Design a binder for this molecule. Structure first.
Ligand SMILES: OC[C@H]1O[C@](O)(CO)[C@@H](O)[C@@H]1O
Ligand SMILES: OC[C@H]1O[C@](O)(CO)[C@@H](O)[C@@H]1O
Lengths: 126, 126
């Protein structure tokens, strides 16, 4: 019941929802803990977001980064937004990739394993 | 008169300053138009920023991205924050790399050429 470009994301894989944003787990996380933070409104380019949505997106991203870094035992974090076709954007919805990083750092999993991961992550936002 | 880790940045290379953030040009931009957006307060990790500083950092980053994409003739933008030593952070100050991207995309320059670039960029924020 969350849009992400032209697909519907099941709530089971969403671990945080705010008044303007939501965070979800990935089917193929690039690194363990690789999650996405998106505005609820499906806009394609970052400049399309209103200031309130910009503040919310990133304050949410900040909270999520802290949680995933902790949960997946990272010691740093990479935050990246591929804003546009020439930056590599595949899904036409603004979103931030949040990746826990460890020193010296296929991944495909079932919806059930994604849902289990989202359930673990929700605990940190209670 | 702007801190960036343990170095002072001359105003001549700063093209935007808000109540909580500032943007500057690079000595060796990775791509033309590669600029940095930083909070005025020198904190090392993204989780250290207050919510108001998070909102300001990214609303500023949004405005800067629009300007540099326009000025350097990009058609997209890459936004990246290397948050921590294991994410590649060299300067211990939170900052966002903003890079205009073009289809199919040493760079060292003098302070004067950096100052000329910052002066061009300020025009867009008048
Ligand atoms: O996903 C990472 C999680 O899995 C473990 O390695 C095994 O349970 C945990 O300590 C960590 O929280
Ligand atoms: O730095 C990019 C700037 O330089 C030019 O290529 C030459 O003046 C411009 O059109 C552009 O605004």
């Amino acid at each position: 019941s969350f849009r992400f470009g032209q697909h519907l994301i099941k709530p089971s894989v969403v671990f945080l929802k705010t008044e303007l944003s939501f965070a979800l787990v990935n089917r193929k996380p690039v690194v363990p803990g690789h999650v996405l933070v998106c505005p609820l409104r499906p806009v394609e380019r970052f400049h399309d977001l209103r200031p309130d949505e910009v503040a919310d997106l990133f304050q949410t991203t900040q909270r999520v980064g802290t949680v995933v870094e902790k949960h997946f035992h990272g010691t740093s974090l990479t935050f990246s937004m591929q804003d546009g076709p020439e930056a590599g954007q595949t899904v036409k919805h603004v979103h931030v990739h949040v990746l826990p990083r460890k020193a010296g750092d296929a991944s495909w999993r079932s919806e059930e394993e994604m849902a289990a991961e989202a359930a673990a992550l929700r605990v940190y936002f209670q």
